[PDB]
Amino acid sequence: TENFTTNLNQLARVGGIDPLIGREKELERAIQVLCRRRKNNPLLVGESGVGKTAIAEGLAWRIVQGDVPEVMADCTIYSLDIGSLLAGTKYRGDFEKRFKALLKQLEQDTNSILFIDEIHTIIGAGAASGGQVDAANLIKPLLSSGKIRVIGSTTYQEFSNIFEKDRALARRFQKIDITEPSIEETVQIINGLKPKYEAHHDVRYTAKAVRAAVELAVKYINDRHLPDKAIDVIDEAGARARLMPVSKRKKTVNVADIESVVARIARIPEKSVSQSDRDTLKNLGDRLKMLVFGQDKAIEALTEAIKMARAGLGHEHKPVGSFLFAGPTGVGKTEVTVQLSKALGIELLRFDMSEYMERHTVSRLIGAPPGYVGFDQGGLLTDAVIKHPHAVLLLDEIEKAHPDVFNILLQVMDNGTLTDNNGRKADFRNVVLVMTTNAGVRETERKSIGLIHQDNSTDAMEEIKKIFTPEFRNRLDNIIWFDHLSTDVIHQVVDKFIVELQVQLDQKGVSLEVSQEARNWLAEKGYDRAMGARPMARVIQDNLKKPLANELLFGSLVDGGQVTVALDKEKNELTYGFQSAQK
Amino acid sequence: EIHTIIGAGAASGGQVDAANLIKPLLSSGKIRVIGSTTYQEFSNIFEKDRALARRFQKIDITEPSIEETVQIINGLKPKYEAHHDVRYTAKAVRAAVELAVKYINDRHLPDKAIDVIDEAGARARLMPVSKRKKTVNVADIESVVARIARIPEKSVSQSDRDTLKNLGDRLKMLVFGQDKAIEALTEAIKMARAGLGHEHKPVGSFLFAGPTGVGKTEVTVQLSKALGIELLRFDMSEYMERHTVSRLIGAPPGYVGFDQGGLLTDAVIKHPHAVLLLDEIEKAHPDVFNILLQVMDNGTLTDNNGRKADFRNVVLVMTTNAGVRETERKSIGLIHQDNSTDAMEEIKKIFTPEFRNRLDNIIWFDHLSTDVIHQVVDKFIVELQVQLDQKGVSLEVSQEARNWLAEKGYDRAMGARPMARVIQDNLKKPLANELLFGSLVDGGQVTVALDKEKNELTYGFQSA
Amino acid sequence: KMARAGLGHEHKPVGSFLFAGPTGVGKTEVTVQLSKALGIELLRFDMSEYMERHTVSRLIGAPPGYVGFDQGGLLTDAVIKHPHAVLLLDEIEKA
Amino acid sequence: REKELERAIQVLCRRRKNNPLLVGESGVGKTAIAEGLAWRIVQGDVPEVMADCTIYSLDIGSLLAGTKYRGDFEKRFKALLKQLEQDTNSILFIDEIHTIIGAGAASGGQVDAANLIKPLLSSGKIRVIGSTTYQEFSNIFEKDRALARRFQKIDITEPSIEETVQIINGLKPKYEAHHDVRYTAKAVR
Amino acid sequence: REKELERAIQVLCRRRKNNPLLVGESGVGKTAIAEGLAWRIVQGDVPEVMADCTIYSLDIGSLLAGTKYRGDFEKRFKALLKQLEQDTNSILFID
Amino acid sequence: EIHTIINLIKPLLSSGKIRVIGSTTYQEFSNIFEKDRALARRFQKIDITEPSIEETVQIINGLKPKYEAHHDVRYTAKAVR
Amino acid sequence: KTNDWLDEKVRDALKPPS
Ligand SMILES: Nc1ncnc2c1ncn2[C@@H]1O[C@H](COP(=O)(O)OP(=O)(O)OP(O)(O)=S)[C@@H](O)[C@H]1O
Ligand SMILES: Nc1ncnc2c1ncn2[C@@H]1O[C@H](COP(=O)(O)OP(=O)(O)OP(O)(O)=S)[C@@H](O)[C@H]1O
Ligand SMILES: Nc1ncnc2c1ncn2[C@@H]1O[C@H](COP(=O)(O)OP(=O)(O)OP(O)(O)=S)[C@@H](O)[C@H]1O
Ligand SMILES: Nc1ncnc2c1ncn2[C@@H]1O[C@H](COP(=O)(O)OP(=O)(O)OP(O)(O)=S)[C@@H](O)[C@H]1O
Ligand SMILES: Nc1ncnc2c1ncn2[C@@H]1O[C@H](COP(=O)(O)OP(=O)(O)O)[C@@H](O)[C@H]1O
Ligand SMILES: Nc1ncnc2c1ncn2[C@@H]1O[C@H](COP(=O)(O)OP(=O)(O)O)[C@@H](O)[C@H]1O
Ligand SMILES: [Mg+2]
Ligand SMILES: [Mg+2]
Ligand SMILES: [Mg+2]
Ligand SMILES: [Mg+2]
Ligand SMILES: [Mg+2]
């Protein structure tokens, strides 16, 4: 039955499978089960990547090497292929003939074992008819008798929902739980496997590189398991060297190479930031200030927090930064957050919390639980952060949302992870969480009933404490209150708005020049402390956009031409002069 | 397994089955045939074919008594003893039935007890190369049952014994204050290994309620690391809705998510000995508490599939923030009042009286004292030092500087978390600029001192 | 005119005008005539129905795992079908 | 798409689990990357190791067609895998890779293409490129933890406006020929 | 339906993604527009490129019925696609 | 009892070559016919209402000669009403 | 008062005539 089964020992001697390091207790338990008089069938149930197939195939490698008990010295393991058995079983009884013949051969030798990988498949082996007859039923009598020994390997999910369903088959197979190895165990495993990977890639792995891969993988790569996770980084690093230049770093791969590979797999900013990134970070605050005038403290907090994470002083299991922006309307809480993403070139995960007003809406962020119509949709927040781990999470109008949503963000701020309905765990370590709240807006604009109008800035903080539970506030890195928009700052805003108009105007071929006198007139006409900088847009729209639009649609400005705006002190009104540049 | 013969043929044209070939003969009664089937298969497969079920006479078979099972092992003792060349003591066979049924629940009594005998003989036969020990002692039976059931309960090892003794001391080094909480966890865990543990309840069911910033979660998280066991951390904010509770015990059969199974039961099955940290239990729906009531007393929870998860070795620690607003509430009057009693009343309102009775102990975490905060500041500096070591930088903080940091950030209501924020602004922010662009880019050195005249810290960086 | 001319906000709707006036003053009718003059769909929405907070879910739809999730939101679906239209919200104060 | 392609070559040259997976939103260009490699291979721009390798595309419908008889599906799937192993320089491209999880199998039977292909992917004998959307990758492909471990995810982020204009300029000769028109430079931008 | 039909031809003439989708309310002549294209082609009232083309109406119900096997649907569906693929001019309609 | 069956029902209706008569319960109509737009459009609802008390006796009287011939015994007019 | 809304092919064997 060479077509259906392959001898692991023969493969081990000439080619080899993998050197097995450790797992002494797991092998001893498996060997003890095989030596049992009855029901001597070990089942290596474990999580994916733990090494369920290494222990089963390692036994053959150990047997040829001779580091096994005397009873197992003559034992031979065969790897069954379910596909090969069903390759040509079109006719009735063909599969039974092949399967029965295979089991019969094992009984005659009485000194061999069968390794069925992904054993969950044989519960539903080829059965043309509806009858329960299948490989599991065929092998069930032999297992109880003890004539043959068959090793098994299946995941917890498959074993619990497929293998367990068959109570008779489960009884014969003695479950052996495989547990993920420790950090120390994994580094030793890589050292034993290092020669095999070094030869294929023609590289030499430094001791620091192997240790860093295991430690870095656990910290950033969470979905996979540690033994598989470390080998992936080590294997990928070797591949890069083969594809690197002819003689730059072929001889050895340093820790820096390992750090870069981990960053690409997890989509996290690489360690040892480049000079280009340093220039962007150094000028991040300066550039942000140009777009958003004033509110330097808010910009400093965001930039300083981002600088700490890249520097290597970031929180162990918390996001880069949690900031609650509270202030009067028009200050620029949303604008600074939006500009931060553009400056850093990272995706902006904008979530309008007004939509999630009711408690039931909380399911949208984490997905509906299993057994409901919304299971397939998943969680908007979890899916978004998974797609874009490095991003700015802008939860605008957070106060509008129900307090239930605040509870969901407790683990995000402290644990640094959120769990989806499907069970997937999101990573919030590299996301910048910014929450804009308009709490106390009514109080701050309100004028107190007294001879002296008390500043209501303090009052706003009281509503924040009432709206948000104390645990939520403690997890936050800081609450940055936007004080107000000064008159001098408003003058700059007029220039910024005119610049926005100029780019829009450039598309139509019209160039606008505004005199300094006209700019000052706009600021005084529309300056409102309570409304912030939003009225500036309205005065500019009515004063400048409305005349230009009429001329642009019908008039001299149909074809792009320069326009001049000047202030007449006698009339205290803007003077618009249009000059056609067509000819 | 007579259920199989009902089918066995569906090929085109023949339209024949084994049951149909033998159906006339059975109806005639000339031939008599014995059969065996599982209860589920008989109701679902054999019962469907009324003709076969009508003819066959059902004979119920059920697990025998404890006394009857040990007798069976004695009867089967010559066979197993001959193969392994071992001899089992009378006490050993009795221990296997009692120990296996106590810890192994999925399997029925006959095979479950015999599985220990067969494995015990193999272990005794295989363990010594010299074959010095042929007989199977009662102690060996206990060890075999432990591995099969994955229970830590066994004779305490010298290596494991030492760690247990210093569990409280090590926890105190990481978590300062809250000695009552550490004592409760350490004493309960010690009892389980000693054997003075609840027969069908978890080793510990502790509810941790305290002010914000106190180390409730940290002690639970650090306990897992000190004991070298997995941490089954289940955030309970996600389970606010009633329908979400099914996720913990699995969706009912026939739905899209039935296959994935329960998240709590599967995790407990994968890690029998682990710390189950149910943080923010207050936020969870009342239905969640109902499930836990069964776990605390019965000791097992059945999922949609029907498998039972063993919580006997699981350390159940549920952190709660109930009555935390009262803790930070400032009472009217010249002198602030202790609102600890008010917080307990809120916990009593949220948690049913029956729930509290089941809990082993309710530990009210006290506010961090000034002395405790000084230790907290040092702990955070150690974490910063470790991060700096990765970049090749060494940080030395003077004693005067540490006291200054403690006073600036010490708030009784807020807790230890403000200390981290102070360290971030005062220490991490300057280092970050130097690390990215400055003397600390490579192989830096740092010194920190408090300017007594200016009452401001001084940061000295050496390129080195 | 400003939006079509290319001098629009580029991130906000064409206009957000609150017409507050006495009954029978023409606030509702001017909007209806605007749609006819422009030949665009009129997304008439009576806000008197949304007297309480729970009714707001209808505008954006029910979340996953709740009844009526398949139905979707009337306001979101209406705007998607007719991008260029006049979104009238009568009796906004009563909402 | 040099950075995206460069990572794919690194994954393909791995000793084990050398199966790159292209996960991105619809329209990003995952198929272009999988097929673009073949186009570059003919030109020779790819590295020397990649040179002389043939990339094939698997039609799931064709493989499952006329497989009613027991074992017909396994015969076709095991025949193709044998071909890839024998060549040693062929890379399979399975578009909409989530489909193999639900390939030909009986109602009760759990044997699928994913289970059959799982042993070969781990050993590294065959290289299999993949392409699937984020929704399908998380709701279907990731559920099969065993299969996901063998496949290495390669995140694809849609190109910027500046990057997109050059893509149109490179694809402009084909669209111009089909429509017999010339696109102005300003029109493309 | 000149305006609606003209949009369809533009989509069909595209090099890639030349699959027009007709979305409308119930009983709006949605099916007639697709069927009408065939009638227009027969009378030679369509553009020269559209002329000499065949429109095929696929029946999902008939194809699904009678398979009773894993590969029956795939073989017939793949067979149908091969016929359309062989003739470049041929177009399919799926109601 | 068409509701019991309801893939091929839709194609025959859409083709229109052969017209089909369908008897379904009022409860089943809402559950199946109303939910499916295609089935509802092709099928036309004909309301079949129970006859009045006077109508019911008349139906029995109209069919009474058939019954009397079958068993050769008759029922009084008072008895049937 | 919210409400939650909860929400054929087999291979065959052929026998040739004897
Ligand atoms: N103790 C070990 N010694 C050496 N290699 C190991 C060990 N444990 C795991 N491995 C590695 O594990 C890989 C083989 O796959 P496993 O970890 O056995 O998972 P698997 O059985 O393929 O998982 P499933 O069943 O497909 S979910 C190779 O990289 C091995 O080198
Ligand atoms: N400091 C500022 N400098 C320049 N433009 C600003 C500033 N603050 C606000 N704006 C502009 O004002 C408009 C609204 O900005 P937002 O960020 O939405 O304001 P905000 O104060 O955060 O709003 P809410 O309603 O209070 S959340 C945009 O056109 C911004 O560019
Ligand atoms: N007693 C403590 N001893 C040492 N560090 C502590 C202590 N309490 C808190 N910390 C520090 O604070 C962090 C741990 O906070 P947690 O214990 O997780 O908070 P928590 O109990 O979940 O908070 P709430 O507000 O009560 S939900 C780590 O940085 C610890 O070092
Ligand atoms: N980098 C690129 N270079 C050249 N053409 C590209 C590129 N990215 C996208 N395209 C074009 O955009 C399309 C990319 O192929 P698609 O089939 O859209 O890929 P896809 O998005 O992976 O597919 P699905 O079906 O959405 S999973 C083709 O029309 C390409 O010509
Ligand atoms: N300014 C107006 N010009 C012409 N007709 C008007 C005017 N104002 C009100 N009407 C009359 O009343 C109608 C509009 O009333 P409407 O604005 O809906 O009232 P309300 O504001 O009380 O809801 C018009 O259709 C017309 O019949
Ligand atoms: N523009 C049109 N020209 C000719 N007949 C039309 C037109 N629009 C509708 N009809 C007639 O009315 C019917 C509309 O139904 P149809 O659009 O096929 O329904 P559905 O979209 O529900 O399948 C057409 O089949 C045809 O008989
Ligand atoms: Mg395996
Ligand atoms: Mg805003
Ligand atoms: Mg806590
Ligand atoms: Mg009105
Ligand atoms: Mg594609």
Side-chain angles (χ1 to χ4, degrees), chain A residues 267 382-389, chain D residues 25 134-135 155 157:
Chain A
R267 306 158 284 189
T382 60
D383 291 3
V385 67
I386 287 160
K387 292 166 183 170
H388 310 267
Chain D
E25 292 291 343
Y134 274 124
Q135 188 177 341
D155 189 13
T157 51

mmCIF file with all atom_site columns, all heavy atoms in Angstrom, chain A residues 267 382-389, chain D residues 25 134-135 155 157:
data_model
loop_
_atom_site.group_PDB
_atom_site.id
_atom_site.type_symbol
_atom_site.label_atom_id
_atom_site.label_alt_id
_atom_site.label_comp_id
_atom_site.label_asym_id
_atom_site.label_entity_id
_atom_site.label_seq_id
_atom_site.pdbx_PDB_ins_code
_atom_site.Cartn_x
_atom_site.Cartn_y
_atom_site.Cartn_z
_atom_site.occupancy
_atom_site.B_iso_or_equiv
_atom_site.pdbx_formal_charge
_atom_site.auth_seq_id
_atom_site.auth_comp_id
_atom_site.auth_asym_id
_atom_site.auth_atom_id
_atom_site.pdbx_PDB_model_num
ATOM 1   N N   . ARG A 1 267 ? 2.213   44.465 10.340 1.00 0.00 ? 267 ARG A N   1
ATOM 2   C CA  . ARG A 1 267 ? 1.871   45.790 9.816  1.00 0.00 ? 267 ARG A CA  1
ATOM 3   C C   . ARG A 1 267 ? 2.000   46.867 10.891 1.00 0.00 ? 267 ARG A C   1
ATOM 4   O O   . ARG A 1 267 ? 1.156   47.759 11.003 1.00 0.00 ? 267 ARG A O   1
ATOM 5   C CB  . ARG A 1 267 ? 0.457   45.810 9.230  1.00 0.00 ? 267 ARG A CB  1
ATOM 6   C CG  . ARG A 1 267 ? 0.157   44.765 8.178  1.00 0.00 ? 267 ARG A CG  1
ATOM 7   C CD  . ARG A 1 267 ? -1.339  44.543 8.078  1.00 0.00 ? 267 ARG A CD  1
ATOM 8   N NE  . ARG A 1 267 ? -1.855  43.748 9.189  1.00 0.00 ? 267 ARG A NE  1
ATOM 9   C CZ  . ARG A 1 267 ? -3.092  43.261 9.265  1.00 0.00 ? 267 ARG A CZ  1
ATOM 10  N NH1 . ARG A 1 267 ? -3.973  43.474 8.293  1.00 0.00 ? 267 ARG A NH1 1
ATOM 11  N NH2 . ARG A 1 267 ? -3.453  42.550 10.323 1.00 0.00 ? 267 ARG A NH2 1
ATOM 12  N N   . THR A 1 382 ? -13.799 46.183 15.058 1.00 0.00 ? 382 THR A N   1
ATOM 13  C CA  . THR A 1 382 ? -12.798 45.123 15.054 1.00 0.00 ? 382 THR A CA  1
ATOM 14  C C   . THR A 1 382 ? -12.246 44.888 13.654 1.00 0.00 ? 382 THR A C   1
ATOM 15  O O   . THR A 1 382 ? -11.034 44.719 13.480 1.00 0.00 ? 382 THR A O   1
ATOM 16  C CB  . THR A 1 382 ? -13.400 43.836 15.614 1.00 0.00 ? 382 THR A CB  1
ATOM 17  O OG1 . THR A 1 382 ? -14.514 43.432 14.806 1.00 0.00 ? 382 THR A OG1 1
ATOM 18  C CG2 . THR A 1 382 ? -13.869 44.045 17.039 1.00 0.00 ? 382 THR A CG2 1
ATOM 19  N N   . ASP A 1 383 ? -13.116 44.847 12.647 1.00 0.00 ? 383 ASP A N   1
ATOM 20  C CA  . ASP A 1 383 ? -12.647 44.638 11.282 1.00 0.00 ? 383 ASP A CA  1
ATOM 21  C C   . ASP A 1 383 ? -11.818 45.821 10.802 1.00 0.00 ? 383 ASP A C   1
ATOM 22  O O   . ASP A 1 383 ? -10.796 45.639 10.129 1.00 0.00 ? 383 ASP A O   1
ATOM 23  C CB  . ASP A 1 383 ? -13.833 44.404 10.350 1.00 0.00 ? 383 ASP A CB  1
ATOM 24  C CG  . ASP A 1 383 ? -14.524 43.080 10.607 1.00 0.00 ? 383 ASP A CG  1
ATOM 25  O OD1 . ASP A 1 383 ? -14.124 42.369 11.553 1.00 0.00 ? 383 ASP A OD1 1
ATOM 26  O OD2 . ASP A 1 383 ? -15.471 42.748 9.862  1.00 0.00 ? 383 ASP A OD2 1
ATOM 27  N N   . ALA A 1 384 ? -12.245 47.040 11.133 1.00 0.00 ? 384 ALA A N   1
ATOM 28  C CA  . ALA A 1 384 ? -11.527 48.234 10.700 1.00 0.00 ? 384 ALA A CA  1
ATOM 29  C C   . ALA A 1 384 ? -10.118 48.287 11.278 1.00 0.00 ? 384 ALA A C   1
ATOM 30  O O   . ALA A 1 384 ? -9.149  48.553 10.556 1.00 0.00 ? 384 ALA A O   1
ATOM 31  C CB  . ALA A 1 384 ? -12.313 49.481 11.098 1.00 0.00 ? 384 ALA A CB  1
ATOM 32  N N   . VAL A 1 385 ? -9.979  48.037 12.580 1.00 0.00 ? 385 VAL A N   1
ATOM 33  C CA  . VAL A 1 385 ? -8.660  48.098 13.203 1.00 0.00 ? 385 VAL A CA  1
ATOM 34  C C   . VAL A 1 385 ? -7.779  46.959 12.707 1.00 0.00 ? 385 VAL A C   1
ATOM 35  O O   . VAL A 1 385 ? -6.561  47.117 12.566 1.00 0.00 ? 385 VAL A O   1
ATOM 36  C CB  . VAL A 1 385 ? -8.783  48.110 14.740 1.00 0.00 ? 385 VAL A CB  1
ATOM 37  C CG1 . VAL A 1 385 ? -9.327  46.798 15.272 1.00 0.00 ? 385 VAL A CG1 1
ATOM 38  C CG2 . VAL A 1 385 ? -7.443  48.419 15.378 1.00 0.00 ? 385 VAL A CG2 1
ATOM 39  N N   . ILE A 1 386 ? -8.369  45.791 12.445 1.00 0.00 ? 386 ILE A N   1
ATOM 40  C CA  . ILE A 1 386 ? -7.587  44.665 11.941 1.00 0.00 ? 386 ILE A CA  1
ATOM 41  C C   . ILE A 1 386 ? -7.032  44.993 10.561 1.00 0.00 ? 386 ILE A C   1
ATOM 42  O O   . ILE A 1 386 ? -5.871  44.696 10.254 1.00 0.00 ? 386 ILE A O   1
ATOM 43  C CB  . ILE A 1 386 ? -8.438  43.381 11.928 1.00 0.00 ? 386 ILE A CB  1
ATOM 44  C CG1 . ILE A 1 386 ? -8.639  42.872 13.358 1.00 0.00 ? 386 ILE A CG1 1
ATOM 45  C CG2 . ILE A 1 386 ? -7.783  42.297 11.079 1.00 0.00 ? 386 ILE A CG2 1
ATOM 46  C CD1 . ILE A 1 386 ? -9.808  41.935 13.525 1.00 0.00 ? 386 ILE A CD1 1
ATOM 47  N N   . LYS A 1 387 ? -7.853  45.604 9.705  1.00 0.00 ? 387 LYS A N   1
ATOM 48  C CA  . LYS A 1 387 ? -7.397  45.969 8.370  1.00 0.00 ? 387 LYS A CA  1
ATOM 49  C C   . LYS A 1 387 ? -6.325  47.050 8.431  1.00 0.00 ? 387 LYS A C   1
ATOM 50  O O   . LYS A 1 387 ? -5.341  46.998 7.684  1.00 0.00 ? 387 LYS A O   1
ATOM 51  C CB  . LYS A 1 387 ? -8.573  46.458 7.528  1.00 0.00 ? 387 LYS A CB  1
ATOM 52  C CG  . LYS A 1 387 ? -9.593  45.400 7.169  1.00 0.00 ? 387 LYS A CG  1
ATOM 53  C CD  . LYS A 1 387 ? -10.871 46.042 6.653  1.00 0.00 ? 387 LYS A CD  1
ATOM 54  C CE  . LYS A 1 387 ? -11.939 45.012 6.346  1.00 0.00 ? 387 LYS A CE  1
ATOM 55  N NZ  . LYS A 1 387 ? -13.257 45.643 6.077  1.00 0.00 ? 387 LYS A NZ  1
ATOM 56  N N   . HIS A 1 388 ? -6.503  48.033 9.317  1.00 0.00 ? 388 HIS A N   1
ATOM 57  C CA  . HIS A 1 388 ? -5.590  49.162 9.480  1.00 0.00 ? 388 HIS A CA  1
ATOM 58  C C   . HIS A 1 388 ? -5.146  49.228 10.938 1.00 0.00 ? 388 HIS A C   1
ATOM 59  O O   . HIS A 1 388 ? -5.683  50.025 11.722 1.00 0.00 ? 388 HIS A O   1
ATOM 60  C CB  . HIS A 1 388 ? -6.257  50.466 9.050  1.00 0.00 ? 388 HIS A CB  1
ATOM 61  C CG  . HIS A 1 388 ? -6.907  50.393 7.704  1.00 0.00 ? 388 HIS A CG  1
ATOM 62  N ND1 . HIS A 1 388 ? -6.256  50.751 6.543  1.00 0.00 ? 388 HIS A ND1 1
ATOM 63  C CD2 . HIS A 1 388 ? -8.148  50.003 7.334  1.00 0.00 ? 388 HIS A CD2 1
ATOM 64  C CE1 . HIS A 1 388 ? -7.070  50.584 5.516  1.00 0.00 ? 388 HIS A CE1 1
ATOM 65  N NE2 . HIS A 1 388 ? -8.225  50.130 5.969  1.00 0.00 ? 388 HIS A NE2 1
ATOM 66  N N   . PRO A 1 389 ? -4.184  48.391 11.347 1.00 0.00 ? 389 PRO A N   1
ATOM 67  C CA  . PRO A 1 389 ? -3.729  48.445 12.747 1.00 0.00 ? 389 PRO A CA  1
ATOM 68  C C   . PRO A 1 389 ? -3.141  49.790 13.132 1.00 0.00 ? 389 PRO A C   1
ATOM 69  O O   . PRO A 1 389 ? -3.428  50.293 14.225 1.00 0.00 ? 389 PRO A O   1
ATOM 70  C CB  . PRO A 1 389 ? -2.690  47.317 12.825 1.00 0.00 ? 389 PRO A CB  1
ATOM 71  C CG  . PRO A 1 389 ? -2.315  47.027 11.429 1.00 0.00 ? 389 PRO A CG  1
ATOM 72  C CD  . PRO A 1 389 ? -3.515  47.312 10.602 1.00 0.00 ? 389 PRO A CD  1
ATOM 73  N N   . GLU D 2 25  ? -8.967  44.569 -0.125 1.00 0.00 ? 25  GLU D N   1
ATOM 74  C CA  . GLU D 2 25  ? -10.323 44.900 -0.527 1.00 0.00 ? 25  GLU D CA  1
ATOM 75  C C   . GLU D 2 25  ? -10.488 44.695 -2.030 1.00 0.00 ? 25  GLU D C   1
ATOM 76  O O   . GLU D 2 25  ? -9.515  44.601 -2.781 1.00 0.00 ? 25  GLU D O   1
ATOM 77  C CB  . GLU D 2 25  ? -10.656 46.339 -0.149 1.00 0.00 ? 25  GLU D CB  1
ATOM 78  C CG  . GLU D 2 25  ? -10.758 46.591 1.347  1.00 0.00 ? 25  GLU D CG  1
ATOM 79  C CD  . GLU D 2 25  ? -11.969 45.931 1.980  1.00 0.00 ? 25  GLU D CD  1
ATOM 80  O OE1 . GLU D 2 25  ? -12.904 45.556 1.241  1.00 0.00 ? 25  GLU D OE1 1
ATOM 81  O OE2 . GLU D 2 25  ? -11.986 45.789 3.220  1.00 0.00 ? 25  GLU D OE2 1
ATOM 82  N N   . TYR D 2 134 ? -11.020 40.662 2.351  1.00 0.00 ? 134 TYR D N   1
ATOM 83  C CA  . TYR D 2 134 ? -10.920 40.715 3.806  1.00 0.00 ? 134 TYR D CA  1
ATOM 84  C C   . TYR D 2 134 ? -12.126 40.064 4.468  1.00 0.00 ? 134 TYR D C   1
ATOM 85  O O   . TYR D 2 134 ? -11.989 39.380 5.488  1.00 0.00 ? 134 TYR D O   1
ATOM 86  C CB  . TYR D 2 134 ? -10.804 42.166 4.279  1.00 0.00 ? 134 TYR D CB  1
ATOM 87  C CG  . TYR D 2 134 ? -9.413  42.761 4.304  1.00 0.00 ? 134 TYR D CG  1
ATOM 88  C CD1 . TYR D 2 134 ? -9.132  43.931 3.616  1.00 0.00 ? 134 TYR D CD1 1
ATOM 89  C CD2 . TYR D 2 134 ? -8.393  42.181 5.044  1.00 0.00 ? 134 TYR D CD2 1
ATOM 90  C CE1 . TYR D 2 134 ? -7.874  44.492 3.644  1.00 0.00 ? 134 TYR D CE1 1
ATOM 91  C CE2 . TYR D 2 134 ? -7.129  42.732 5.073  1.00 0.00 ? 134 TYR D CE2 1
ATOM 92  C CZ  . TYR D 2 134 ? -6.877  43.889 4.371  1.00 0.00 ? 134 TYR D CZ  1
ATOM 93  O OH  . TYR D 2 134 ? -5.620  44.445 4.398  1.00 0.00 ? 134 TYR D OH  1
ATOM 94  N N   . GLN D 2 135 ? -13.318 40.278 3.909  1.00 0.00 ? 135 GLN D N   1
ATOM 95  C CA  . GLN D 2 135 ? -14.528 39.697 4.482  1.00 0.00 ? 135 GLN D CA  1
ATOM 96  C C   . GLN D 2 135 ? -14.479 38.177 4.434  1.00 0.00 ? 135 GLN D C   1
ATOM 97  O O   . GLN D 2 135 ? -14.732 37.500 5.438  1.00 0.00 ? 135 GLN D O   1
ATOM 98  C CB  . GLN D 2 135 ? -15.754 40.222 3.735  1.00 0.00 ? 135 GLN D CB  1
ATOM 99  C CG  . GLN D 2 135 ? -17.085 39.830 4.353  1.00 0.00 ? 135 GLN D CG  1
ATOM 100 C CD  . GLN D 2 135 ? -18.266 40.434 3.620  1.00 0.00 ? 135 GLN D CD  1
ATOM 101 O OE1 . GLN D 2 135 ? -18.122 41.402 2.876  1.00 0.00 ? 135 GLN D OE1 1
ATOM 102 N NE2 . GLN D 2 135 ? -19.446 39.858 3.825  1.00 0.00 ? 135 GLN D NE2 1
ATOM 103 N N   . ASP D 2 155 ? -0.688  41.901 3.183  1.00 0.00 ? 155 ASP D N   1
ATOM 104 C CA  . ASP D 2 155 ? -1.630  43.009 3.141  1.00 0.00 ? 155 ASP D CA  1
ATOM 105 C C   . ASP D 2 155 ? -1.416  43.859 1.898  1.00 0.00 ? 155 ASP D C   1
ATOM 106 O O   . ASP D 2 155 ? -0.284  44.225 1.567  1.00 0.00 ? 155 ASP D O   1
ATOM 107 C CB  . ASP D 2 155 ? -1.482  43.863 4.394  1.00 0.00 ? 155 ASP D CB  1
ATOM 108 C CG  . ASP D 2 155 ? -2.575  44.909 4.523  1.00 0.00 ? 155 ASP D CG  1
ATOM 109 O OD1 . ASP D 2 155 ? -3.580  44.819 3.786  1.00 0.00 ? 155 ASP D OD1 1
ATOM 110 O OD2 . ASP D 2 155 ? -2.428  45.821 5.364  1.00 0.00 ? 155 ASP D OD2 1
ATOM 111 N N   . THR D 2 157 ? -2.616  47.401 0.250  1.00 0.00 ? 157 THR D N   1
ATOM 112 C CA  . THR D 2 157 ? -3.206  48.706 0.518  1.00 0.00 ? 157 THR D CA  1
ATOM 113 C C   . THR D 2 157 ? -3.341  49.433 -0.810 1.00 0.00 ? 157 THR D C   1
ATOM 114 O O   . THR D 2 157 ? -2.360  49.543 -1.554 1.00 0.00 ? 157 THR D O   1
ATOM 115 C CB  . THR D 2 157 ? -2.344  49.514 1.489  1.00 0.00 ? 157 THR D CB  1
ATOM 116 O OG1 . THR D 2 157 ? -0.985  49.524 1.033  1.00 0.00 ? 157 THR D OG1 1
ATOM 117 C CG2 . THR D 2 157 ? -2.403  48.911 2.883  1.00 0.00 ? 157 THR D CG2 1
#
